[PDB]
Design a protein around this ligand. Structure first.
Ligand SMILES: *[C@@H]1O[C@H](CO)[C@@H](O)[C@H](O)[C@H]1NC(C)=O
Ligand SMILES: [Cl-]
Ligand code: NI
Ligand code: NI
Lengths: 216, 219
């Protein structure tokens, strides 16, 4: 009977502020503390702060100067406000109950992904990765997806019908745009006769691109 | 701040075996009120963390009896008695005793399997990318174990560090292997000024590296 729902922006410009609302149900903010935690991409959890039943707050020492937590008891809302965001404040931000005392209300928000960037919406370029001249049972093919913003893109092969032996790598930042690749291993007994095509979708730009992988 | 030192960073186990994860605090985390607010969380890919153990040794609602927390003072331990598939993920200790509250660095619980060498594939830049004035050389290192690997790029015998981006998959659910992409991005001008491109992978399975290379003039 317990949840925390979050509302906040997915995209913040550098030097602008971040505001997230956490709406609690199944317990009272007048009796229990609520905490804020973030997780930077590929890093561990970091505790940011807490607002206690009575309204006082404590913060992580590195955030005291730019973070404030407030709340509204009657509406079961907790407000996270942080100033002067930079690219390295990109993270998933969570509200949650932790430091469990007399209760069993130890539940977390689903989390709000916040990306801090000045980049404009940019569709990917999609390039085929076909074997260079260099013959066992499998051939490795791929698609290079370069220079898009924001995340995500989705990559499928043969419209989702080819799912075995696919590895789609996590995207990485190159300057202020994202890049990733996807590899697929297919039988040399069926390729190129049986075609292989990566399908790349970038919802933010309404881009849908097909790249057929052919021998060089 | 109280530093929480969590070991090991990574913990390979076979299904059915026992896992032991350690958390050491830089000072005592017994609160004035007599409680020790030591908590263990499990986070699975793409999900919020979930509480397993609170106040050092109390199992949270729904948490199986195979999870056991113990310790006192500055030394704490999570034991998982017979590891199942649903237990895989990253474990974090947390102290809620002294503000500011703090997390351990995490422990990745993963499947132990037989060592496997990577399948290495190298791709020259596509004609379509070259047409655009860019030149990316991609190397895939697929289906290897353990996850520890080092990839070197050599251009005409000389190691290149600038403009290399690496990305790693999570442990595969089917075969428990890891994969990696390594991508070297150059200008078309830079690409056309050198001949030999090499992706060199050093992995536990061989004392000698796997060496994949192409020569631009042989394309
Ligand atoms: C990284 O974080 C520091 C504060 O810890 C900040 O001063 C700096 O501007 C940030 N840099 C980027 C590139 O986000
Ligand atoms: Cl509380
Ligand atoms: Ni040179
Ligand atoms: Ni070639």
């Amino acid at each position: 009977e317990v949840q925390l729902v979050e509302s906040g922006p997915g995209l913040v410009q550098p030097s602008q502020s971040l505001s997230i609302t956490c709406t609690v149900s199944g317990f009272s903010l007048s009796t229990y503390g609520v905490h804020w935690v973030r997780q930077s991409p590929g890093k561990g959890l970091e505790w940011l702060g807490v607002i206690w039943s009575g309204g006082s707050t404590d913060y992580n020492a590195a955030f005291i100067s730019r973070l404030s937590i407030t709340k509204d008891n009657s509406k079961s809302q907790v407000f996270f406000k942080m100033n002067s965001l930079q690219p390295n404040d990109t993270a998933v931000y969570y509200c949650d109950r932790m430091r469990i005392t007399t209760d069993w209300f130890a539940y977390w928000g689903q989390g709000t992904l916040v990306t801090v960037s000045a980049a404009k919406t940019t569709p990917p370029s999609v390039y085929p990765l076909a074997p260079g001249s260099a013959t066992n049972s499998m051939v490795t093919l791929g698609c290079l997806v370069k220079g898009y913003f924001p995340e995500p893109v989705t990559v499928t092969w043969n419209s989702g019908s080819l799912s075995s032996g696919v590895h789609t790598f996590p995207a990485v930042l190159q300057s202020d745009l994202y890049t990733l690749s996807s590899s697929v291993t297919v039988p040399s007994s069926t390729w190129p006769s049986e075609t292989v095509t990566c399908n790349v979708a970038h919802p933010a730009s309404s881009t849908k691109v097909d790249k057929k992988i052919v021998p060089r | 701040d109280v530093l929480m030192t969590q070991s090991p960073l990574s913990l390979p186990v076979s299904l059915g075996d026992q896992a032991s994860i350690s958390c050491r605090s830089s000072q005592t985390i017994v609160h004035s009120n007599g409680n020790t607010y030591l908590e263990w969380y499990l986070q699975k890919p793409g999900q919020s963390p979930k509480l397993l153990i609170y106040k050092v040794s109390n199992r949270f609602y729904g948490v199986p009896d195979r999870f056991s927390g113990s310790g006192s003072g500055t030394d704490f331990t999570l034991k998982i008695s017979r590891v199942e598939a649903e237990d895989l993920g990253v474990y974090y200790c947390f102290q809620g005793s002294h503000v500011p509250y703090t997390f351990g660095g995490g422990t990745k619980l993963e499947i132990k399997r037989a060592d496997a060498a990577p399948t290495v594939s190298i791709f020259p830049p596509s004609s379509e990318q070259l047409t655009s004035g860019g030149a990316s050389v991609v190397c895939f290192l697929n289906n290897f174990y353990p996850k520890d690997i080092n990839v070197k790029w050599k251009i005409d015998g000389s190691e290149r560090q600038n403009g290399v981006l690496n990305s790693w998959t999570d442990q595969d659910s089917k075969d428990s292997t890891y994969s990696m992409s390594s991508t070297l991005t150059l200008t078309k001008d830079e690409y056309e000024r050198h001949n030999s491109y090499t992706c060199e992978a050093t992995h536990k399975t061989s004392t000698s590296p796997i060496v994949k290379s192409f020569n631009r003039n042989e394309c």
